């Protein structure tokens, strides 16, 4: 939970799906997950990746993971575990 490279891609996809599905017990818990997502990706779009995607970006869970993955690849940042 410390850094994105602590998650496997399959773990991160589960996390992203939880968020997209609002699969939490409370709004507070969802906002916490969203904050962690933003901290993990370090992407400057923040929560907009999930909620306010650019035109023609895939905002499915796997779509979001791929956008994150490629952006970090493009910006020389570490990838997923494993």
């Amino acid at each position: 939970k410390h850094s994105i490279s602590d998650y496997t891609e399959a773990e991160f996809l589960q996390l992203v799906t939880t968020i997209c599905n609002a699969d939490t017990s409370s709004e507070e818990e969802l906002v916490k997950l969203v904050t962690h997502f933003e901290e993990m990706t370090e992407h400057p779009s923040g929560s907009d990746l999930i909620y306010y995607p650019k035109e023609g970006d895939d905002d499915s869970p796997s779509g979001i993971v791929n956008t994150v993955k490629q952006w970090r690849a493009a910006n020389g940042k570490s990838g997923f575990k494993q």
């Binding site: 968020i19 997209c20 599905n21 609002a22 409370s26 709004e27 969802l30 906002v31 969203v34 904050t35 779009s45 923040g46 929560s47 907009d48 999930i50 909620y51 306010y52 995607p53 905002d59």
Partner: protein
């Protein structure tokens, strides 16, 4: 003092006609009003607290095809649970990332808690701008 917002009460008021981009308005002026069709669904119903009322508001949003249609699929899942939708990143303030319901006339100066004509939907950023100018 006992908190009125923490006590049950009965929703009243009319709200106003809004369009399918109503939430874009939450970021400017005095925020967006409660949609009249939301008011129509909630008026005369009793709620346990202002938080209970706000949940009912977001549930009614998710059930109204016109008011929920601008929401993306993830924001739609959120409102379906009765959570407030996430605002654009540029409208968030720290840990405040969802639309907020605020009272236009303050309760301490006689504003009513569940008077839906006394409630505005704001982004966290817009609420803070308004508050800082008081």
């Amino acid at each position: 003092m006992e908190s009125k917002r923490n006590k049950p009460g009965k929703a009243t008021g009319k709200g106003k006609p809004v369009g399918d981009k109503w939430l874009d308005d939450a970021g400017k002026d005095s925020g967006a009003p409660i949609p009249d069709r939301i008011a129509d669904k909630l008026r005369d119903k009793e709620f346990k607290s202002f938080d209970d009322f706000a949940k009912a508001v977001w549930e009614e949003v998710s059930k109204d095809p016109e008011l929920s249609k601008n929401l993306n699929p993830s924001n739609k899942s959120s409102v379906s649970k009765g959570y407030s939708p996430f605002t654009p990143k540029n409208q968030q303030v720290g840990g405040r990332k969802v639309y907020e319901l605020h009272h236009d006339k303050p309760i301490s100066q006689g504003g009513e808690v569940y008077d839906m004509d006394n409630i505005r939907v704001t982004t966290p950023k817009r609420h803070i701008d308004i508050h800082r100018g008081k």
